[PDB]
Symmetry: C3
Subunit: 116 residues, 3 copies
């Protein structure tokens, strides 16, 4: 999948190894090779959650399949856990948007994933 | 809802209290508690609208329901209004992408809104 | 269309003319007037692709129509070509999310396109 995290937590507070941990945990959680996983972390953002500028995160996870009720709840537990532990963001100040992408709507390497 | 604004307007030109005003106006516009509202403003961006780098904004509004023809037109009038008044961005240089999210596809507090 | 590029390539490596080239090529590829096209480039990003921090890009393209199997493959060839030539990013380290937007879900100029 592609996972993006936007947060008002300062860049200095993002630990060494964070992108690599996200990559590995996402591979494990989805049962996919890490070569497919893209991660993007955007600190120092001007944002508010519930009208408060305390630490928060707005996130997106895109995947061709592997998106659904139980799976998404599991991703949320995993990702909120990591954001709490590594960035000290409270899970109730995190939103994650999940997108189930069609293969034909995902570009890569000069084409898309619809080759049929 | 979740509202994101990306703009080439300078950070200094974003007034104090802008995030609070967005939170308040969105709460009122959608008839929802402000505790649910997330807002995100990203200034100083490298962007062009119609080939020009005069002030512009690219935005998104995500909501679980409360998205639709008439509602979106009302949101657009409101949000373009705020961007024009507060950030001095012309309404014809604003795009807003609206998304009607399923509760099962929105994560929060270690779970989703599908319980 | 609206096209967004997020990349870990440094700001200084984005050439003069890049936004304008993207604007013109997107107009040509979609047949849309350039007046409609919005482009946004975000350099110096903290990202990884396949666990590596070599140059990469995560992109999105939104359009009211003009989205589909063959068209998206054509856009990918075009855009990966530009990112490779201009930003020195390898095409196999680019992801692009395509969105076919309903006109009622796109706001502009105090209203929507519906
Ligand atoms: N099936 S998978 O390896 O998890 C992937 N899904 C997406 C979705 C969007 C996207 O831009 C990239 C990918 S990779
Ligand atoms: N029903 S509501 O309070 O307006 C909400 N909708 C969304 C959608 C996405 C999202 O990430 C967060 C929320 S809160
Ligand atoms: N028909 S078109 O000129 O290519 C456009 N489509 C969109 C979609 C979303 C959006 O935010 C803006 C535009 S312009």
């Amino acid at each position: 999948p592609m996972f993006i995290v936007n947060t008002n937590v300062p860049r200095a507070s993002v630990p060494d190894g964070f992108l690599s941990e996200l990559t590995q945990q996402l591979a494990q959680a989805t049962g996919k090779p890490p070569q497919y996983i893209a991660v993007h972390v955007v600190p120092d953002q001007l944002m508010a959650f519930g009208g408060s500028s305390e630490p928060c995160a707005l996130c997106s996870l895109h995947s061709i399949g592997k998106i659904g009720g139980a799976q998404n709840r599991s991703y949320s537990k995993l990702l909120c856990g990591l954001l709490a532990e590594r960035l000290r963001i409270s899970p109730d100040r995190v939103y994650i948007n999940y997108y189930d992408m069609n293969a034909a709507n995902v570009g890569w390497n000069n084409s898309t994933f619809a080759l049929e």
